[PDB]
Design an enzyme around this catalytic site. Structure first.
Site, mmCIF file in Angstrom:
data_model
loop_
_atom_site.group_PDB
_atom_site.id
_atom_site.type_symbol
_atom_site.label_atom_id
_atom_site.label_comp_id
_atom_site.label_asym_id
_atom_site.label_seq_id
_atom_site.Cartn_x
_atom_site.Cartn_y
_atom_site.Cartn_z
ATOM 1 N N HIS B 40 0.606 -1.259 -0.081
ATOM 2 C CA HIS B 40 -0.135 -0.471 0.186
ATOM 3 C C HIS B 40 0.997 1.146 0.088
ATOM 4 O O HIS B 40 0.009 1.934 -0.156
ATOM 5 C CB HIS B 40 -1.216 0.184 1.055
ATOM 6 C CG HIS B 40 -2.223 -0.822 0.175
ATOM 7 N ND1 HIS B 40 -2.040 -2.038 0.142
ATOM 8 C CD2 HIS B 40 -3.433 -0.421 -0.489
ATOM 9 C CE1 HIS B 40 -3.608 -2.468 -0.529
ATOM 10 N NE2 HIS B 40 -3.790 -1.382 -1.169
ATOM 11 N N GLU B 71 0.115 -8.170 0.666
ATOM 12 C CA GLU B 71 0.470 -6.345 1.248
ATOM 13 C C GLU B 71 2.042 -6.289 1.715
ATOM 14 O O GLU B 71 2.607 -5.752 1.894
ATOM 15 C CB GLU B 71 0.129 -6.157 2.386
ATOM 16 C CG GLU B 71 0.025 -4.907 3.502
ATOM 17 C CD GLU B 71 -0.102 -3.589 2.331
ATOM 18 O OE1 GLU B 71 -0.718 -4.453 1.062
ATOM 19 O OE2 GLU B 71 0.035 -2.500 2.655
ATOM 20 N N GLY B 145 2.519 6.183 10.375
ATOM 21 C CA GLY B 145 4.633 5.887 10.516
ATOM 22 C C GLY B 145 5.292 5.271 10.803
ATOM 23 O O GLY B 145 6.473 4.970 11.047
ATOM 24 N N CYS B 147 4.588 1.979 9.936
ATOM 25 C CA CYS B 147 4.359 0.939 8.143
ATOM 26 C C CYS B 147 5.738 0.846 7.442
ATOM 27 O O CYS B 147 6.862 1.732 7.624
ATOM 28 C CB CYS B 147 4.108 1.634 7.316
ATOM 29 S SG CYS B 147 1.388 0.841 8.129
HETATM 30 C C1 LIG Z 1 0.721 2.399 7.509
HETATM 31 C C2 LIG Z 1 1.200 3.317 6.756
HETATM 32 C C3 LIG Z 1 0.627 4.508 7.109
HETATM 33 O O1 LIG Z 1 0.725 5.728 8.206
HETATM 34 O O2 LIG Z 1 0.129 5.708 6.173
HETATM 35 C C4 LIG Z 1 -1.364 5.641 4.801
HETATM 36 C C5 LIG Z 1 -0.908 6.182 3.782
HETATM 37 C C6 LIG Z 1 -0.270 2.422 8.596
HETATM 38 C C7 LIG Z 1 -0.258 1.619 10.276
HETATM 39 C C8 LIG Z 1 -1.725 1.986 10.862
HETATM 40 C C9 LIG Z 1 -2.469 2.404 11.342
HETATM 41 C C10 LIG Z 1 -3.492 3.177 12.230
HETATM 42 N N1 LIG Z 1 -2.377 1.983 13.131
HETATM 43 C C11 LIG Z 1 -1.680 1.126 12.350
HETATM 44 O O3 LIG Z 1 -0.618 0.521 13.318
HETATM 45 N N2 LIG Z 1 -0.843 1.478 8.140
HETATM 46 C C12 LIG Z 1 -2.047 2.501 7.868
HETATM 47 O O4 LIG Z 1 -2.789 2.892 7.937
HETATM 48 C C13 LIG Z 1 -2.739 0.748 6.419
HETATM 49 C C14 LIG Z 1 -3.059 1.029 5.226
HETATM 50 C C15 LIG Z 1 -1.867 1.323 4.974
HETATM 51 C C16 LIG Z 1 -1.380 2.174 4.005
HETATM 52 C C17 LIG Z 1 0.437 2.200 3.653
HETATM 53 C C18 LIG Z 1 0.833 1.585 4.033
HETATM 54 C C19 LIG Z 1 0.811 -0.087 4.676
HETATM 55 C C20 LIG Z 1 -0.571 -0.017 4.720
HETATM 56 N N3 LIG Z 1 -4.846 0.590 7.132
HETATM 57 C C21 LIG Z 1 -4.990 0.545 8.345
HETATM 58 O O5 LIG Z 1 -4.227 -0.057 9.112
HETATM 59 C C22 LIG Z 1 -5.929 0.801 8.512
HETATM 60 N N4 LIG Z 1 -6.578 -0.235 9.586
HETATM 61 C C23 LIG Z 1 -7.601 -1.108 9.619
HETATM 62 O O6 LIG Z 1 -8.620 -1.341 8.329
HETATM 63 O O7 LIG Z 1 -8.388 -2.357 9.923
HETATM 64 C C24 LIG Z 1 -9.157 -3.261 10.171
HETATM 65 C C25 LIG Z 1 -10.504 -2.301 10.208
HETATM 66 C C26 LIG Z 1 -8.884 -4.149 9.316
HETATM 67 C C27 LIG Z 1 -9.091 -3.569 12.257
HETATM 68 C C28 LIG Z 1 -6.745 2.001 9.925
HETATM 69 C C29 LIG Z 1 -6.014 2.996 9.024
HETATM 70 O O8 LIG Z 1 -7.818 2.417 9.499
HETATM 71 C C30 LIG Z 1 -8.878 2.174 10.641
HETATM 72 C C31 LIG Z 1 -8.976 1.321 11.702
HETATM 73 C C32 LIG Z 1 -8.034 3.424 11.517
HETATM 74 C C33 LIG Z 1 -10.328 2.572 10.549
#
Ligand SMILES: *[C@@H](CC(=O)OCC)[C@H](C[C@@H]1CCNC1=O)NC(=O)[C@H](Cc1ccccc1)NC(=O)[C@@H](NC(=O)OC(C)(C)C)[C@@H](C)OC(C)(C)C
Ligand SMILES: *[C@@H](CC(=O)OCC)[C@H](C[C@@H]1CCNC1=O)NC(=O)[C@H](Cc1ccccc1)NC(=O)[C@@H](NC(=O)OC(C)(C)C)[C@@H](C)OC(C)(C)C
Lengths: 188, 188
Positions: B40, B71, B145, B147
């Site tokens: 992602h 992923e 931050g 990932c």
């Molecule tokens: C790392 C990437 C980032 O910060 O940039 C976004 C472009 C984050 C880490 C997680 C966010 C919240 N806490 C974390 O540990 N990952 C992501 O944002 C995931 C998508 C992604 C984007 C770029 C690279 C890799 C991954 N998305 C999520 O983690 C979502 N979680 C989720 O959908 O979990 C379930 C609902 C399936 C249980 C977060 C953003 O979604 C919410 C839970 C906030 C609704």
């Protein structure tokens, strides 16, 4: 290498999350119900400790004999648990150190460890436009959210994080004699 | 306790900061000029590596035989330094683990270590509304931050951080066979 194990033992038994009007700060418990927090946290007469509202029975904002901010405030807290007594881990004297760890315990980062490298007895710093003494410096890009963070080497708890400029971080020293059972003295 | 020393050796010799259109990600280098990043992140044909613009010679977005997102994206990079070969530290099989460390290397956090505790082979996750397989889960409130962050136990590099819900964190597994020198195959 860095003393991660020592840092973790301190974090586990001796830190809590503290929250004042200024936000959240890692908080080191030293002995009994006595802890520390950066003076710029602005402790009042109550404070949140792990989200529980808590009476501040005493708060001493440390200054040296030049009447200069040391950026340490010692607080006495109304709570049931005693902190493990860690005064024997505090340095007797100012000093420079090797290979230190900065450890943070907040809501955002309930447990995080950052090797900051060498730590130097820096002295004076115009911190946030307040003259401040007895500062430790490390070359690491420390951030908002890390104040109160505990700076250790193995076997020593040396200070708490208080500031940075985007390239270095700054801690206020902790010395053993800040916490020795002491003197009858009107302090407020 | 957690294998901080192992985590640090991996971070020191095998991570770089990668930046795509989606922002910054910790990036694990596996061998030669081959590294990984969360799918992602949206890798294109160039990427910043420690702020140096770098040609992406190959990018394979891994999917399993159900045509489901894993992923993980494996990238081949045009740069001079070879990564130390760490394939012998990758697990052969899916598994559960104890006492893992999540390590981050970005501009904001050039070196940070977080004990996340037990890690379980979780399987399916509807990550960000994309079906995803082979997920590892840990009960820790991981943040944006983080990932790409590297999940280790002693002697094993087990995955990279990809997601969270405010209470748990999720990593995509790394398996040894993702990186074995292999098969003549048109892949784009
Ligand atoms: C790392 C990437 C980032 O910060 O940039 C976004 C472009 C984050 C880490 C997680 C966010 C919240 N806490 C974390 O540990 N990952 C992501 O944002 C995931 C998508 C992604 C984007 C770029 C690279 C890799 C991954 N998305 C999520 O983690 C979502 N979680 C989720 O959908 O979990 C379930 C609902 C399936 C249980 C977060 C953003 O979604 C919410 C839970 C906030 C609704
Ligand atoms: C911890 C407290 C916090 O985040 O909340 C503010 C209410 C931060 C940590 C540092 C911020 C930037 N990086 C850090 O490591 N400390 C502070 O903000 C210091 C004031 C403070 C407030 C509450 C409790 C304890 C301390 N202020 C600074 O660190 C300033 N640094 C500074 O003045 O350094 C010199 C110029 C003297 C070299 C920062 C905010 O100032 C700038 C450098 C951004 C101009």
């Amino acid at each position: 290498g860095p003393g991660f194990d020592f840092a973790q033992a301190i974090m586990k038994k001796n830190t809590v999350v503290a929250r004042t009007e200024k936000g959240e700060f890692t908080m080191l418990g030293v002995h009994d119900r006595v802890a520390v927090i950066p003076t710029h946290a602005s402790v009042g007469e109550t404070i949140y400790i792990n989200d529980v509202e808590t009476k501040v029975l005493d708060a001493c904002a440390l200054r040296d004999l030049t009447d200069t901010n040391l950026e340490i405030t010692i607080v006495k807290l109304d709570r049931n648990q005693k902190f493990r007594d860690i005064r024997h881990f505090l340095p007797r004297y100012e000093d420079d150190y090797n290979d230190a760890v900065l450890s943070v315990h907040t809501s955002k980062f309930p447990n995080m460890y950052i090797p900051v490298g060498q730590v130097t007895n820096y002295g004076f710093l115009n911190l946030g436009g307040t003259p401040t003494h007895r500062i430790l410096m490390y070359n690491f890009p420390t951030r908002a959210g890390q104040c109160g963070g505990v700076v250790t080497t193995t076997g020593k708890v040396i200070g708490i994080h208080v500031g940075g400029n985007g390239a270095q971080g700054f801690a206020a020293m902790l010395l053993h004699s800040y916490f020795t059972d002491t003197q009858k003295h009107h302090h407020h």
